[PDB]
Amino acid sequence: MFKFIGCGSAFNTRLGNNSAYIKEDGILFMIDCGSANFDRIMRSDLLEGVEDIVVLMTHTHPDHVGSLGDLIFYSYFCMGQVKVPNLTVYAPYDMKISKVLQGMGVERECYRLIQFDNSNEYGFHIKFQVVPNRHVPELLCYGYLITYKDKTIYYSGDANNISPFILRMLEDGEIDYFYQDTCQADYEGNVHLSLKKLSEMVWANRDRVYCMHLDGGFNREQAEELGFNVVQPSYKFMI
Template identity: 45%
Template sequence: MVITHTHPDHVGSLGDVIFYSYYILKHKPTIFFPQKELIEKFLTSIGVSTEMYNLNSNNVEAINDMKLGDFSIDFMPVSHVDTIPAYGFIMKLNGSVFYYSGDANGISNTIVDKLKNGHICRIYQDTCGLDYEGNAHLSLRKLCDTIPHEFRNKVYCMHLDKNITAEDIKHNGFNVVDIYK
């Protein structure tokens, strides 16, 4: 499990998933999060002991998984809120490289440059309709200001709010992440 930050909408059921994996599936899940002390303290505070999971807190990690094969995760700090650290990450998987923003109110020039020069094939970006100073999420207007038209078809908007529609996003040349239920 890759954790980008500790807001409840991102880790609220993490303890349940670990308990289920450990007690029912008899499996210790691996958690990827670059702030070891923070995630251990969080999990301990909800009753999850360290022997129930494996923790990888490296900023960059290359993994060989029996099911997924070779992949790597490269965490990078993102701007979201002042109260907790937040991260996006670049993942290399099956020869494909993508960026996942987590919750972020911007996209770094480094990521945009990697998209432009072909080092990243897709961006998954937290996007909202509200546009105000200090917003914890990236507004569609700011996304339009950040990504040139010719690269927008490689950007997938996610974590949408009620102030934005799929039509708004598509009209500006971006994609909307499909939700599977």
């Protein structure tokens, strides 16, 4: 169901920062807004015809929150009714997203913030359920089970593992689209899931698995040979 504003790892900025979106009925829904991505959005026509923006947060690394404040300010000052919020951030309460934004001078008057512990929701309807994922110990990091147009989508966020319960859902056909942070590098303490490990953990329904957050060394040919899909920025974001 998802298209991508960006799909690279933090240093692979030619693909943009990893961020998926849905645009429908004047609503722009996106997961994360990394440092590189506000400029990509502004150079595209993605915001044309958009009445309301919704941003769902996975964690606050710079390649996931670094330009959210730019987008908040732009939507507040320049979109629709000037100086009225038209962007809603959704985040787990424990992430303390407002404190991160306030550190950059982004105050609550500029956006709407909906926080939750377990789940929440936003003709456009979307639901999401938190899946805490391990990534770095410095930050609380999340993926999500997302329900949209009667499809079930798993979106890992940045993650170096997959819960056995989520794997079982995928194996049993209960996840229609499975977006997974995957990297080529394979090493102890990896903060991302290697392609090798992904191939060891998923045998069934590989055709529903989409590798994202791709590092510069990522071997797309090998990923496809194994039966996985590899995401790329949407054609809107490619020359």
